[PDB]
Amino acid sequence: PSEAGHRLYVKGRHLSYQRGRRNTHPKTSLIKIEGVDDTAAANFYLGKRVAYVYRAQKEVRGTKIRVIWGKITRPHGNSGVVRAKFTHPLPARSFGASVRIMLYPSSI
Amino acid sequence: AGTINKPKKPTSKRKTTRLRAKISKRAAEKKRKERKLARKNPEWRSKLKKDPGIPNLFPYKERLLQQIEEERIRRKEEL
Amino acid sequence: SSFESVVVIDGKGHLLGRLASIVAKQLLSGQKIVVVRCEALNISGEFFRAKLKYHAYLRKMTRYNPTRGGPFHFRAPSRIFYKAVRGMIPHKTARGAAALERLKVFEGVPPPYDKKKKMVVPQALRVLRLQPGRKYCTVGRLSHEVGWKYQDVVARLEERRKAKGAAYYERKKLAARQLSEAKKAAAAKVDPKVSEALAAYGY
Amino acid sequence: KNLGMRKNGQVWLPAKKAFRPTKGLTSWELRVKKRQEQAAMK
Amino acid sequence: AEINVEATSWRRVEVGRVLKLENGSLAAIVEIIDHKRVLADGPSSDPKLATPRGIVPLSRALLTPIVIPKLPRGARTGAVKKAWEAYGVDAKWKETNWAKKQLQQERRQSLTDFDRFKVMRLKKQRRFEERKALAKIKAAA
Amino acid sequence: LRSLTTVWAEHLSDEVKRRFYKNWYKSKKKAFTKYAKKYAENNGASITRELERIKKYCTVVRVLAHTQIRKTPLKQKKAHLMEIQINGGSVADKVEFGRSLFEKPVTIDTIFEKDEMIDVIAVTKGHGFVGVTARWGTKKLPRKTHKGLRKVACIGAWHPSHVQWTVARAGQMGYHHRTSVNHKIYRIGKGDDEAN
Amino acid sequence: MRYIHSEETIPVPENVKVSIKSRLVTVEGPRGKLQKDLSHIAVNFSVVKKGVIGLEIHHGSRKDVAALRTVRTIINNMIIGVTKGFKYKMRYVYAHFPINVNVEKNAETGCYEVEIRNFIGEKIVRKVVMAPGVEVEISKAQKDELILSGNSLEAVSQSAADIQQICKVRNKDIRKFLDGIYVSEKGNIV
Amino acid sequence: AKSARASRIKENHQRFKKNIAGPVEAARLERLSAKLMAIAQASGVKSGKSIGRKDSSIVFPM
Amino acid sequence: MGRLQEYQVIGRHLPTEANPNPALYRMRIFAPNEVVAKSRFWYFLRGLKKVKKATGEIVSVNVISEKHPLKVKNFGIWLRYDSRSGTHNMYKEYRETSRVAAVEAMYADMAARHRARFRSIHILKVVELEKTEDVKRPYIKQLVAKNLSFPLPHRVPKISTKKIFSAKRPSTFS
RNA sequence: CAUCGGUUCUGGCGGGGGGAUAAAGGCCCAGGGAAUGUGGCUCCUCCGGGAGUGUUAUAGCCCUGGGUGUAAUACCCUCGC
RNA sequence: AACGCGACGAUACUACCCGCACGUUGUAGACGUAUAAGAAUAGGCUCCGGCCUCGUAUCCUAGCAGGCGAUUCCUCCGCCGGCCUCGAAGUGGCCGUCGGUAAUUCGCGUAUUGCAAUUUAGACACGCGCGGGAUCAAAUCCUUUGCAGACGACUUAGAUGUG
């Protein structure tokens, strides 16, 4: 049988909100995409949709798993970090959690 | 001294606001005072400062002096 | 940059503060880090400067009670590296405590980390950072001189581990020899079209 | 064998040469010519 | 007197030494400006290996094992090109292991999805043959 | 140091089995009863295997020994059990020595000898709660001193705004663990001697 | 200023075998072998000529260039030690109490031991253990003389200094009390 | 006065230990060990000669 | 003091009835741009010829490009710099391929070795040394030596700062 | 998702103009010169290489003038896609 | 260390262990969550031929989230058992049985989830169940003791006995 995987997304980590030294702004999050280390590499992922997938307690409409959807908006800094905007701001407890960057909307 | 095995109380490099303000005030006061002393200074000062000249290790000093003689003779002839 | 289950780092040859910075950033980004051979870490400068700094640290203690609240001075090299890491993380917060739970520090290489890949961090390597002629010291030597008790036990255990590693390396060299012979033998029985197809594709 | 006496008694020490790390950059003849030019300009 | 010395034999920056730059081009050294900078010239007919004449920082270059013999110091582009074509720098560079590594890197970078699938299948067939050979070898001893 | 394994003898006395209980009078006294069966099953294979583990892995070997408290005039029937280190020889020698010594009585004159200086370890006489005058030896305050004269007048006249750990306070006196060194043995008398 | 290249040369006699690997110098001659680890100094070793050892420093400061002279003298001292040897003659002098010096060779350690008694009438027995490779002999040609010989100049001179420093007159006028053991001659065995 | 931690006092005590108290303690140890030794003398898997396994974590759970 | 160019700046006093054809003054100014070049020009004529900006004009500003930027040259710079003691002469040497590169290296060198800023440094002469025997400083004399060659011991390999971890320990031999 | 509007971030491509009508540079033509002196010759050697002589030879370089040439390219400005 | 750790003894139950049967059970966050030389860095590696900037590497990687049947191959993987082996916080090697398995090729099936909507899929821990195997324990109050003690706490004794 098949011994391969099924991943069609790119792994990312939710680092923090957009912030100064003291003030933070939850409306924008910062994402580290795996293997993306510069602005030229980050420009490929602009506009790509990104999902934060987590687990809840109650089973609602056949599932315990909830998703928050957003999109990548612009590069951040010089090291390949990107800014992302979700429908709701990501939880503050999820600093260091994983997100899935999809390959759609595709322009290839 | 036995500094390594038994160090003493450290000297703090962390300033205080009062000391910073006092030092800035005293520096400004000293600047104003030396301005006043420069205005009231009795010391003799030359109208033209003593120029250091051309360094000896400069390789083209001699040809530069040759030039300087050439412009002084040219100015003497023109005048 | 890649995400791993856990990164095991050989602490030999690394500068303490720079390794602490890189490890603390990985911990707060969400990466699990194990550091082994903390007794082989390096501090730049003379050994007496690190010794003086540790004695100046040892001076500090809560005056009214040395059993509570005071700076508790840990003498082991793994705990010295842990203190350097902890001073660089918001450890009084829940996020900082969560980042500190993703770290493990040891003297020597206890099992099963002796059969795991140990990575190096080039931005903290002494041979790549320190200028030639500049002096450096050993955290293990500092620990032994300020009261760590287990330098000789760790040394004997590392000797046994390195003997076992030498035996494993002899087996590995034998396996590599047979693998090279197997590739040379199978070069004849592989379809030639497959051969230049793979060669043109670059493998 | 050596014929002279060393002051500190370390008779095994070799006949050391002068510590001149800038030795060999310029020649003697060129330095003599530069001496002449320097004296004339001065 | 028996003297046995085992030390480090670095390559030397010198006139005639060929440098590989970070973009893969080559350049023969014409002048040594200081310990950090040189003047270099790549007069190669291959556009990938060509380098315009200019200052090359030694931190941004690597020392190849190719030295053009008797290259005059300060020689201009015509004489450097004549010496380059006479010595055959491009052929020796192609024979070096650095250019083979670069060629392998370009071949791996130029693969498409169909190419990667075909690579995986052909590698599985070659792996099957190698596994049979390794089983035969390990069965022997 | 870390204790790796412990090997016990086949038969243990009731006075040492009393050490493993609080209510021995109510108990079924089941202690070491399943352990005694591994001396019989498989010809003591588990006991032998633990012994070889001690021989090949350990560096410090201590016997476990208990007192025969029934020979004393004490009303206590539960005996005292301690680890006594074996010094000298190799580790295998120590292990064979302990195996040879299992279920055997050791008299005091085979460990200590007359004219030897030893150390004595014990808990001191208890005094309960005691003021500073007897607990620390502080000077008494003058007669009819208000709020007490068996006290310390100042417990912190200077900064910090705290009581320091070095200031004498009323508390528990005695029942402290003490190790006293260099005590000379003058006679090791035998109980069977009617003129000791 | 950083000097591009600095060079030192060490001549080697014909009866000497020198092996340098990873800055660990091993020098072998008729009198034995000497070994010195010089990995604390950045130096490039080479064979510039038959019988000449070359020392290079590249892009070094003045201090780094000057360290080559120390390396040159250390290796030359190793060569002299394995060819001719080193010898320190010490004399012990006394005013009233004769200094009793006993020289033994310890069996299990192989080192020499020097016992000094009756130093200014003291009842203590001073004992100095020599460095390995150093042989101590009570001289027969002259009076009240020890001879310390060996291949390592460092070891021989340090043993001589240890013998000299163990016999110090304390809390007495040193103009009046001249008692002690002093180094009298330094030279080669051959 | 020389303290109990003084180097000369330590060297004096070490010489006393090596040359005087040492043989006495050794003879006493030989006698006591002889007496207590007199009292003392008075498949690998299935036999226990091969040491098999007996009948918080250092790693992250994976 | 930045990416500099050498400018020929020619200026003059404004013509009057008494002087209908005033004299023209030319200087060579190392400056990042034309505004700074003209400002430095008027500063130097204020210091020398007592000619002000309001009573004068700029006649010409041109860029002086290097004649042979691909040839390695030795440059001697005679300069005066102002410190807390006063004004000091210095002569220094720089091995560069252009006069502007020599002046930039000079500015960085005086900043590094004497903490002298741009405003306290007056460049009095920049010359190209015509002969090898004209070189005075040992740090250029060692570079103009015959058959110059050297290795590069202890080279740190170029490793990307975004690659945090490496599986092998790097070498410093190439 | 597609087609638009507003604001904005970012990537690439095609032109035009300027300056010493960039400065260089390649290939030619005509002069001039030197060494960190190529070949040749002479003298030493550890036979590995040194020292001396002199101006292109069995390498080359530097300075000036001219042609290709309204050359290319950099930098700056600018018209668009 | 009362929120550090080890060894050992006895463990009644709804307690313990084994199998499979799943969780409106949880977890700072599975998705190939693959990869052991040591050592030096003014030197190393090796198969002894040579090789070393470079993990931009190696292993693995196709089939209904991967079916059924052949052609074909003896390659790879897993559970058990035996013998060894592994103590720094203990686990790997070999052999054997059994089960699975495109390295080559082919046939039948996939639709309709309707143009995307986490790809509900992993590990550990906890719990509820059966079907079996194994085992019949202690502590405290109470009375007593005075080696102890403000009270708690502590040393003792209370089941037939040297009580």
mmCIF file with all atom_site columns, C-alpha atoms in Angstrom, chain F residues 4-5 42 44-45 48-50 52-53 56-57 97 100-101 104-107 109-117, chain H residues 24-25 27-29 31-33 35-42 44-55:
data_model
loop_
_atom_site.group_PDB
_atom_site.id
_atom_site.type_symbol
_atom_site.label_atom_id
_atom_site.label_alt_id
_atom_site.label_comp_id
_atom_site.label_asym_id
_atom_site.label_entity_id
_atom_site.label_seq_id
_atom_site.pdbx_PDB_ins_code
_atom_site.Cartn_x
_atom_site.Cartn_y
_atom_site.Cartn_z
_atom_site.occupancy
_atom_site.B_iso_or_equiv
_atom_site.pdbx_formal_charge
_atom_site.auth_seq_id
_atom_site.auth_comp_id
_atom_site.auth_asym_id
_atom_site.auth_atom_id
_atom_site.pdbx_PDB_model_num
ATOM 1  C CA . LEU F 1 4   ? 20.298 0.000   42.644 1.00 0.00 ? 4   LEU F CA 1
ATOM 2  C CA . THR F 1 5   ? 19.014 -3.204  44.291 1.00 0.00 ? 5   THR F CA 1
ATOM 3  C CA . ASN F 1 42  ? 14.107 -21.619 40.118 1.00 0.00 ? 42  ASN F CA 1
ATOM 4  C CA . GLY F 1 44  ? 17.088 -18.832 43.789 1.00 0.00 ? 44  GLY F CA 1
ATOM 5  C CA . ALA F 1 45  ? 17.607 -17.472 40.272 1.00 0.00 ? 45  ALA F CA 1
ATOM 6  C CA . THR F 1 48  ? 21.467 -14.801 42.302 1.00 0.00 ? 48  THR F CA 1
ATOM 7  C CA . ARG F 1 49  ? 20.671 -12.385 39.457 1.00 0.00 ? 49  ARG F CA 1
ATOM 8  C CA . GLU F 1 50  ? 20.313 -9.455  41.863 1.00 0.00 ? 50  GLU F CA 1
ATOM 9  C CA . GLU F 1 52  ? 25.403 -10.410 40.109 1.00 0.00 ? 52  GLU F CA 1
ATOM 10 C CA . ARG F 1 53  ? 23.792 -7.036  39.376 1.00 0.00 ? 53  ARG F CA 1
ATOM 11 C CA . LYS F 1 56  ? 28.939 -5.860  38.254 1.00 0.00 ? 56  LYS F CA 1
ATOM 12 C CA . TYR F 1 57  ? 27.240 -2.451  38.553 1.00 0.00 ? 57  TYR F CA 1
ATOM 13 C CA . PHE F 1 97  ? 31.172 -11.289 52.351 1.00 0.00 ? 97  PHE F CA 1
ATOM 14 C CA . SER F 1 100 ? 28.331 -15.246 53.816 1.00 0.00 ? 100 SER F CA 1
ATOM 15 C CA . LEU F 1 101 ? 27.073 -13.044 56.668 1.00 0.00 ? 101 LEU F CA 1
ATOM 16 C CA . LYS F 1 104 ? 24.270 -14.495 61.206 1.00 0.00 ? 104 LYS F CA 1
ATOM 17 C CA . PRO F 1 105 ? 24.993 -12.664 64.479 1.00 0.00 ? 105 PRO F CA 1
ATOM 18 C CA . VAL F 1 106 ? 27.950 -10.284 64.604 1.00 0.00 ? 106 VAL F CA 1
ATOM 19 C CA . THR F 1 107 ? 29.391 -9.462  68.013 1.00 0.00 ? 107 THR F CA 1
ATOM 20 C CA . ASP F 1 109 ? 34.360 -7.195  69.305 1.00 0.00 ? 109 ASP F CA 1
ATOM 21 C CA . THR F 1 110 ? 34.659 -8.258  65.657 1.00 0.00 ? 110 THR F CA 1
ATOM 22 C CA . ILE F 1 111 ? 33.890 -4.710  64.499 1.00 0.00 ? 111 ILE F CA 1
ATOM 23 C CA . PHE F 1 112 ? 35.481 -2.607  67.252 1.00 0.00 ? 112 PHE F CA 1
ATOM 24 C CA . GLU F 1 113 ? 38.436 -3.291  69.525 1.00 0.00 ? 113 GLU F CA 1
ATOM 25 C CA . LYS F 1 114 ? 39.630 -1.987  72.888 1.00 0.00 ? 114 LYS F CA 1
ATOM 26 C CA . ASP F 1 115 ? 41.903 1.121   72.638 1.00 0.00 ? 115 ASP F CA 1
ATOM 27 C CA . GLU F 1 116 ? 40.091 2.390   69.523 1.00 0.00 ? 116 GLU F CA 1
ATOM 28 C CA . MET F 1 117 ? 38.632 5.866   69.125 1.00 0.00 ? 117 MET F CA 1
ATOM 29 C CA . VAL H 2 24  ? 48.732 0.514   64.351 1.00 0.00 ? 24  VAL H CA 1
ATOM 30 C CA . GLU H 2 25  ? 45.406 1.059   62.590 1.00 0.00 ? 25  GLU H CA 1
ATOM 31 C CA . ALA H 2 27  ? 47.234 -4.158  62.418 1.00 0.00 ? 27  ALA H CA 1
ATOM 32 C CA . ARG H 2 28  ? 43.942 -3.547  64.240 1.00 0.00 ? 28  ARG H CA 1
ATOM 33 C CA . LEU H 2 29  ? 42.078 -3.730  60.918 1.00 0.00 ? 29  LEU H CA 1
ATOM 34 C CA . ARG H 2 31  ? 42.830 -8.574  63.386 1.00 0.00 ? 31  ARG H CA 1
ATOM 35 C CA . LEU H 2 32  ? 39.213 -7.380  63.207 1.00 0.00 ? 32  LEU H CA 1
ATOM 36 C CA . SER H 2 33  ? 38.827 -8.486  59.583 1.00 0.00 ? 33  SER H CA 1
ATOM 37 C CA . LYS H 2 35  ? 37.756 -12.359 63.279 1.00 0.00 ? 35  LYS H CA 1
ATOM 38 C CA . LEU H 2 36  ? 34.767 -11.218 61.235 1.00 0.00 ? 36  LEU H CA 1
ATOM 39 C CA . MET H 2 37  ? 35.876 -13.347 58.271 1.00 0.00 ? 37  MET H CA 1
ATOM 40 C CA . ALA H 2 38  ? 36.072 -16.318 60.646 1.00 0.00 ? 38  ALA H CA 1
ATOM 41 C CA . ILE H 2 39  ? 32.429 -15.642 61.533 1.00 0.00 ? 39  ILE H CA 1
ATOM 42 C CA . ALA H 2 40  ? 31.566 -15.231 57.835 1.00 0.00 ? 40  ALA H CA 1
ATOM 43 C CA . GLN H 2 41  ? 33.227 -18.536 56.873 1.00 0.00 ? 41  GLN H CA 1
ATOM 44 C CA . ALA H 2 42  ? 31.799 -20.347 59.912 1.00 0.00 ? 42  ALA H CA 1
ATOM 45 C CA . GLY H 2 44  ? 22.181 -17.494 31.907 1.00 0.00 ? 44  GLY H CA 1
ATOM 46 C CA . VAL H 2 45  ? 18.613 -16.211 31.533 1.00 0.00 ? 45  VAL H CA 1
ATOM 47 C CA . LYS H 2 46  ? 17.153 -19.148 33.477 1.00 0.00 ? 46  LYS H CA 1
ATOM 48 C CA . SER H 2 47  ? 20.029 -19.303 35.993 1.00 0.00 ? 47  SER H CA 1
ATOM 49 C CA . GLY H 2 48  ? 20.544 -15.621 36.828 1.00 0.00 ? 48  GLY H CA 1
ATOM 50 C CA . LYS H 2 49  ? 24.130 -15.514 35.551 1.00 0.00 ? 49  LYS H CA 1
ATOM 51 C CA . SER H 2 50  ? 22.958 -13.324 32.673 1.00 0.00 ? 50  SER H CA 1
ATOM 52 C CA . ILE H 2 51  ? 21.447 -10.192 34.184 1.00 0.00 ? 51  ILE H CA 1
ATOM 53 C CA . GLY H 2 52  ? 18.087 -9.493  32.580 1.00 0.00 ? 52  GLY H CA 1
ATOM 54 C CA . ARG H 2 53  ? 15.481 -6.912  33.460 1.00 0.00 ? 53  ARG H CA 1
ATOM 55 C CA . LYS H 2 54  ? 13.854 -7.013  36.879 1.00 0.00 ? 54  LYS H CA 1
ATOM 56 C CA . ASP H 2 55  ? 10.273 -8.231  37.142 1.00 0.00 ? 55  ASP H CA 1
#
